[PDB]
Amino acid sequence: DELKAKAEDAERRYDLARAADIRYYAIPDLEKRLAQLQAEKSQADAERADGLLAEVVGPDQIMEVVSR
Amino acid sequence: IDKLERRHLQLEVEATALEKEKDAASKQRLQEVRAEMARIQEELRPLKMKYESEKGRLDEIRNLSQRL
Fold this sequence. Notes:
This is part of a larger assembly, with two copies of chain A.
Chain A: H1 2-12, H2 16-23, H3 26-48, H4 59-67
Helix pairs in contact in A: 1-2
PDB class: chaperone
Keywords: Spiral hexamer, antagonize toxin, ADP-binding state, chaperone
Entry title: Calcarisporiella thermophila Hsp104
């Protein structure tokens, strides 16, 4: 979220040496690292056959706030 | 007019990063970006210069009435 915000500021301020070095260099290098971790989460949930119920915010975490 | 102006600045940032890479994947893509910028300005000049001509002349009339 920080690289996409700083790249748009360099485009409006007429700076081609900064916006082009982030959108096609910093962003692609950071998105490929997240894709490697997404495949590890799907493979770990198949062996457990139930996953982690203490990670996704659902109706269980909403009723506890009102009860307090 | 704003849609053609916003897309014109985005193609300039992409064409900047393609000039730093010299391979069999950046020279072909750079020719497609420069060809798209020529067609955007083709339909923008009859509309951008027409809007600036009406705005530039209407604003001058307001300055004349304020001094009369």
